[PDB]
Design a protein that fits this description.
The structure is a homodimer. By secondary structure, chain A is of the alpha/beta class. Chain A folds into two domains: about 290 residues, Alpha-Beta Barrel (TIM Barrel), CATH 3.20.20.70; about 100 residues, Immunoglobulin-like, CATH 2.60.40.1180. An eight-stranded parallel β-sheet of chain A has the order 7-6-5-4-3-2-1-8. In chain A, strand 13 and strand 14 form a beta hairpin. Chain A is globular, with a radius of gyration of 21 Å. Chains A and B meet through helix 1, helix 8 and helix 10 of A and helix 1 of B. One copy of the ligand OC[C@@H]1[C@H](O)[C@H](O)[C@@H](O)CN1C(=S)Nc1ccc(F)cc1 binds next to loops of chain B. Chain A: Its EC number is 3.2.1.22. Chain A: It is found in: Lysosome. Chain A: Belongs to the glycosyl hydrolase 27 family.
């Protein structure tokens, strides 16, 4: 999408995985989807160094809407849970120097049964812009035909442009299209800033593996299309929650950087361990994710329960990720000739290699003739940055 | 098996899950199966408070053997990886007040291809006794028929007894019997101190869920059989490794306490987080596992991605574990009438409830009519102790 936005992968916070569709504000007032929840995350994004790290978009997922549209056919925030309205919430978020994302659906309903946008693409777009909304996540539930889906995503895309406001456009277009016919990613990129490719993430190592396995399997179809203004979206970061070990959290951070993925955290900033905070705020790794070149990484090789991924960076630098998919035993040794890395120009005639994850450690100079040797924890990942000696 | 041993569930350290069958001592000297590894593990069990916590048995799994037997038909430790021999290693372990476990197989190979014990049950048992071995893990690989399997496990049990030495007898008998016919646990309890029921654990939340789900599915078949001298073995503790989140580590510890399981750690004591160490050394939770009554717990109820487990303790006390199997979202509220806990006698007429996991917190007095209210993390477990009392 050529609207000048998402020149690097969008970074921010999205409530869905951690808070879902909690409407019980009476017995769980602190976890329910409400204006208060987003106010609290906004404050901590500022005060706990999240904004300084690049996390800029505070996004509302499903279940913010009133059950019905007002008398003039426009969408409504829930009168009890969002009593000051979305525009006033956007004003607050902007006052702290952040941007606001919101959620709508191409179909007749959102996935949680709330009013869909089909038949209202223009008024909804103008409504969002008038509210001061800076991002739109547009879901694909309750849509009958393939044609209405494609027409709807396109219609909304043009509708946003014509508002005149800069609004990052998030699509789930290919996800709802895949089980029927293969997507045109050139067409999708044309209308969308990012696009969800695969099933919802949750708080598990199983989910992460499924995403990595689907991406590497379909990479000849999705890697090259990605670039400034249009990214593949393998869904939210779930680091800082309950279902991932430290090494599995490391694997998600490393690989979502390799994949040039949007970094939308879905966690509770009010309750997050120092360990998870430092990982999510790792400047060197975020910088890899945010590389100006914007070329998505890919899976180099795969065998012996090992995976090697690499991503070309600006200034002849490369990022390399080695995963240990063996879920038994201890740290396993993996060795690769550095000449096989970076299509053969990363370490020619030499390169300096720096480990970034799980810990930052200079490994030194590697000659064109050299072999990189590493021990990787089960379900963990080693992330390296390679600087060519020229 | 009443040989006077395993009156409470055996506690110790077993190398298999973390180190497996690493034989490459030249390129992986820190992970290979060698006398030095067990020597150093022995030192740390003492110095890092593991022995004081109850972890008493240092156990060698598969891949300690030389490729074949000596001139006298006896088993040999590998001359390169165990150059000082098992006897001197047992002497070393005993000097630190610990006990040594070793591994053999009913068939005529171990699972990793090293010399098996079929045809050598007596000499192998006597060999172990002469070496000073205090525990035997007896595997069931490369065994053809049901009767050779059953006879082999029986024979070794008697072969060990006739040595006169106290040796905890750990069997994998029922696990290797499942693919033929369902096991007779009465016969098994007669010959074994504990027994492996299900497939090997590994370093994952999937394996733990898989072990819990089969245990509760088969619990009316295996729970009552458990007691002093004979326990169900749902395999090693993998807390302290790489594949479990903190809440999943809590879940294993809590439920291995509930199940009255042997607590065999499989980790690297040289490299373990303070957090995993404190959990593994939790006296209150260990005490539940080691409860003198020796009655195995069970799954009370199950629904809405929740599980409730409970275990009757000595002195009219109960341990209660609540699991959240939902792997998305946040902490979930769960509420239960305390009269439904401990078969209605735990809080009769009242009980004092103390939370042990994820953190220790006194909850106070609950009368028979009252309701227990709790929040459980995804894939986590809340562990409670209920003490019957009058107030
Ligand atoms: C609407 O779309 C047009 C293009 O279709 C956007 O104009 C582009 O803006 C970028 C940076 O602002 C320029 O580098 C491109 O050259 C422009 N393209 C054309 C064809 O003019 C415009 O920014 C979009 N408007 C909004 C509000 O997003
Ligand atoms: C060999 O088996 C016998 C038979 O059970 C064991 O003898 C029992 O020992 C326990 C405690 O030591 C006593 O309470 C039982 O009364 C004994 N039974 C009989 C029939 O005497 C004996 O301990 C075993 N010996 C070894 C070395 O395992
Ligand atoms: O509401 C839809 C739901 C969530 O609320 C979030 O908005 C998104 O993360 C995605 N989402 C859903 S159902 N995605 C989805 C759509 C189709 C499918 F086959 C599997 C998953
Ligand atoms: O070598 C065998 C292996 C280990 O080394 C240990 O001895 C034990 O933890 C068990 N073990 C094996 S393969 N156990 C096993 C796992 C699944 C199965 F269907 C039958 C047996
Ligand atoms: C919305 O519902 C109407 C009425 O059933 C239907 O005709 C229309 O096709 C639906 N739109 C989509 C996009 O599914
Ligand atoms: C897909 O990309 C663009 C988008 O409309 C289109 O021009 C192109 O012809 C399409 N290619 C195929 C093979 O459909
Ligand atoms: C052990 O060896 C003998 C002879 O090779 C054979 O009869 C038997 O099946 C083997 N395996 C067993 C007993 O599990
Ligand atoms: C199982 O227990 C003993 C073990 O020898 C045996 O005598 C008994 O008959 C068996 N029970 C059944 C129901 O087969």
């Amino acid at each position: 999408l050529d609207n000048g936005l998402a020149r690097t992968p969008t970074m921010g916070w999205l409530h869905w995985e951690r808070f879902m569709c909690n409407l019980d504000c009476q017995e769980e007032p602190d976890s329910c989807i409400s204006e208060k929840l987003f106010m609290e995350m906004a404050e901590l994004m500022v005060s706990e160094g999240w904004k300084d790290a690049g996390y800029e978009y505070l996004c509302i997922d499903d279940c913010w809407m009133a059950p019905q549209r007002d008398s003039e056919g426009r969408l409504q925030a829930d009168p009890q849970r969002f009593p000051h309205g979305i525009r006033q919430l956007a004003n607050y978020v902007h006052s702290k120097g952040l941007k606001l994302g919101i959620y709508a659906d191409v179909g007749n309903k959102t996935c949680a049964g709330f009013p869909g946008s089909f038949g209202y693409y223009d008024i909804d777009a103008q409504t969002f812009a008038d509210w001061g909304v800076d991002l739109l996540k547009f879901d694909g539930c309750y849509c009958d035909s393939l044609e209405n889906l494609a027409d709807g995503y396109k219609h909304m895309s043009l509708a946003l442009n014509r508002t005149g406001r800069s609004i990052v456009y998030s699509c789930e277009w290919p996800l709802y299209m895949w089980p029927f016919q293969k997507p045109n990613y050139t067409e999708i990129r044309q209308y969308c800033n990012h696009w969800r490719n695969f099933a919802d993430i949750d708080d598990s190592w199983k989910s992460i593996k499924s995403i990595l396995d689907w991406t590497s399997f379909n990479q000849e179809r999705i890697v090259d299309v990605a670039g400034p203004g249009g990214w593949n979206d393998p869904d939210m970061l779930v680091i800082g929650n309950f279902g991932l070990s430290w090494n599995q959290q490391v694997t998600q951070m490393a690989l979502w950087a390799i994949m040039a993925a949007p970094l939308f955290m879905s966690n509770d900033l009010r309750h997050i361990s120092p360990q998870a905070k430092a990982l999510l705020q790792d400047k060197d790794v975020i910088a890899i994710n945010q590389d100006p070149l914007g070329k998505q990484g890919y899976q180099l090789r795969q065998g012996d329960n090992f995976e090697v991924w690499e991503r070309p960076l600006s200034g002849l630098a490369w990022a390399v990720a080695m995963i240990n998919r063996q879920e038994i035993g201890g740290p396993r040794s993996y060795t690769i000739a550095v000449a096989s890395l970076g299509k053969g120009v990363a370490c020619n005639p030499a390169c300096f290699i720096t480990q970034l994850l799980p810990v930052k450690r200079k490994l030194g100079f590697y000659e064109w003739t050299s072999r990189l040797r590493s021990h990787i924890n089960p379900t963990g990942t080693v992330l390296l940055q390679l600087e060519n000696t020229m």
